[PDB]
Design a protein around this ligand. Structure first.
Ligand code: NI
Length: 341
């Protein structure tokens, strides 16, 4: 059954709760973003109302084949009414179309559900600043002080300079970027822009990108692999074997690969700066690991919550074991004692 952390009190709403069949009482199912864990269970066979951003609606329509009658897209930053209740969707700074949802309950309680998010100080000057939030449903993916990472802009700058150097040294080098869902598009779009190239990719991936309301998209991406010097492949192919195999397929148009694996955190965040990063190399193939995160670091999450000063926190990630919940509660109490709420 649907856990209490996916239910919004004193409404019949749920959030990211599609894997439990019919939820008893639920009149509206909200979807924060188009990542498989959150949408798990949605298909062309679903027959209840789904509320979401315009981008998430495009993806539901085109990728999952959910029938149009059940998709209720809402604009961002706009007060809307859903089944008698005031809501606002806000940019989550996660992947394309990802939202936080603000729910203004009839009794006067205000609830923020973050979805998946990367907390940022620009969120301190949104509609959130206008009133007290009593309850926060929080993306606790990286809720532990070991999780640090550079800014997105630091990582992109590094990727750009690296790629530009490599292809100026060898104009027959190919650049490959690994990918598995939506998100982290800036990695490949920024590398292509410095090289004066479009991004080549499979038909299914191109179809996905064509849903995302990216300006001038047709000038940036193609299904003609031949004509482009940045290619997208599945993350699983980003290794020496998969990459040599791909190089054989391109028909001697390239003689070297430089590949990037955008990852979350891995243990080498605890010593290395982005400027110290060096690739793994075998022959004419080099693979760079780059920690491009679309989740809050510990410090970013701590700052947002200490600013917001919620009266109660409901974790939505790592809630499956008592040890994780206990550990998280410890950090929430520390933050509250430091900040005086
Ligand atoms: Ni996500």
């Amino acid at each position: 059954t649907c856990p209490f952390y996916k239910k919004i009190p004193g409404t019949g709403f749920t959030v990211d709760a599609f894997q439990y069949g019919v939820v008893e009482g639920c009149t509206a199912y909200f979807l924060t973003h188009f990542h498989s864990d959150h949408y798990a269970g949605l298909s062309k066979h679903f027959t209840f109302p789904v509320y979401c951003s315009e981008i998430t609606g495009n993806l539901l329509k085109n990728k999952l084949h959910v029938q149009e009658q059940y998709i209720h897209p809402l604009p961002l930053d706009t007060e809307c009414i859903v089944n008698g209740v005031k809501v606002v969707l806000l940019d989550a700074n996660h992947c394309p179309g990802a939202v936080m949802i603000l729910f203004y309950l009839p009794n006067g309680t205000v609830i923020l559900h973050t979805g998946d998010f990367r907390a940022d100080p620009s969120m301190e000057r949104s509609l959130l600043a206008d009133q007290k939030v009593h309850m926060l449903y929080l993306d606790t993916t990286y809720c532990s002080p070991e999780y640090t990472f550079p800014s997105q802009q630091e990582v992109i700058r590094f990727a750009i300079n690296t790629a530009f150097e490599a292809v100026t040294l060898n104009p027959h080098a190919l650049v490959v970027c690994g990918t598995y869902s939506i998100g982290k598009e800036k990695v490949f779009l920024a590398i292509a822009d410095v090289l004066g190239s479009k991004v080549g990719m499979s038909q299914e991936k191109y179809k996905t990108l064509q849903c995302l309301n990216i300006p001038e998209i047709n000038s940036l991406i193609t299904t003609d692999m031949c004509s482009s010097l940045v290619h997208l492949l599945p993350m699983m192919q980003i290794n020496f074997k998969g990459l040599q195999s791909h190089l054989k397929k391109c028909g001697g148009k390239y003689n070297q690969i430089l590949a990037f694996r955008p990852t979350g955190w891995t243990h080498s965040n605890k010593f290395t700066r982005i400027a110290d990063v060096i690739p793994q190399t075998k022959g004419n193939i080099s693979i760079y690991g780059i920690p491009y995160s679309e989740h809050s670091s510990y410090l970013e999450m701590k700052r947002f919550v200490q600013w917001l000063k919620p009266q109660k926190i409901i974790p939505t990630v790592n809630v499956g074991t008592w040890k994780s919940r206990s550990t998280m509660e410890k950090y929430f109490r520390e933050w509250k004692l430091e900040a005086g709420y």
